[PDB]
Amino acid sequence: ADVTAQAVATWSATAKKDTTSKLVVTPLGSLAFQYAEGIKGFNSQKGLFDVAIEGDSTATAFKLTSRLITNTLTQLDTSGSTLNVGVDYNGTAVEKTGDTVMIDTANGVLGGNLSPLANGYNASNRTTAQDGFTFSIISGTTNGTTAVTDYSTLPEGIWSGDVSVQFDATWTS
Amino acid sequence: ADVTAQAVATWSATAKKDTTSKLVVTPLGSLAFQYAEGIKGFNSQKGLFDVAIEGDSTATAFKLTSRLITNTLTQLDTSGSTLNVGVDYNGTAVEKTGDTVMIDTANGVLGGNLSPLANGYNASNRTTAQDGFTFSIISGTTNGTTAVTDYSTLPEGIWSGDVSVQFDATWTS
């Protein structure tokens, strides 16, 4: 039978619209979105991750996929306003409804920066690699229900929440 | 009248005890605590942050404090097991019940690695500096209510939660 493993990677995220910037404090690695009056929208953020796997010495193929679990940021006050964070892996969406292929040795995918996993999955020891996702704001609500993509219509304030991505590894023999 | 500003810095945190590590994925900058049988407890980790302030040309003193807001990690399963994360700044606890002084120019506390802020607070530019807190596991429960003394008594699994710290800046003249 296949060997399978799962891990969930969670980033904390904040977004700000029209708030004071007299004091800004940012944990390293955190996803920080800022509404820009300039372009009427939010910046994107690259968020990096480290992966480690244990080798399966008799495996003959390896697959690594990702799937979005949570992505909702909510304002800190009484507004109920939310933002949803889109996640991209090398130009391909990582969504809640499917598994985005990152490595698939059988079908001709190495995973780019994740290539060490594609080469080490059937070593007898552990293999490590580092890559990232691009995170962006893909929708929002004024109040938790009324959805928008015109972000100029959002109430001012701060949103926060966790963005969690599930990773699924499969070793085949 | 003095000028004040506030910001909340949030880290995503995960703790693990005796779980399978066939696949491990770790967002950069996230807090990660691993139980080790040898020490009967978890590692600590220094989590870094950047602080940016806007100058106030009329000010004659500056103060920056921190206060812990949330620090509870909860297991992902039905256990109800919790861990609480302690936060230290240069050997002084940052707690939920008071404000820990980081900079206080009126009293010659310049802020160590944050000292550029003490120098630039009344300048007419943005000043940025970096520092960190040491994060550690300071308490835990087996089930949400039973306090443990010996971490070896914890149920196996993964705890996750956000650790959030409020920063407060005051410019006086």
Curated annotation (Swiss-Prot), chains A, B:
The keyword Calcium does not apply. Induction: Negatively regulated by H-NS. Positively regulated by IHF and EcpR. InterPro entries: EcpA, Fimbrillin_EcpA_sf. It is found in: Fimbrium. Changing L76D: Decreases ability to form biofilms. GO terms for cellular component: pilus. Changing K46E: Decreases ability to form biofilms. Its main location: other. Keywords: Fimbrium, Signal. The keyword Transmembrane does not apply. Self-associates. Forms filaments. Interacts with EcpD. Part of the ecpRABCDE operon, which encodes the E.coli common pilus (ECP). ECP is found in both commensal and pathogenic strains and plays a dual role in early-stage biofilm development and host cell recognition. Major subunit of the fimbria. Belongs to the EcpA/MatB fimbrillin family. This is Common pilus major fimbrillin subunit EcpA. The lineage of its organism: Bacteria, Pseudomonadati, Pseudomonadota, Gammaproteobacteria, Enterobacterales.
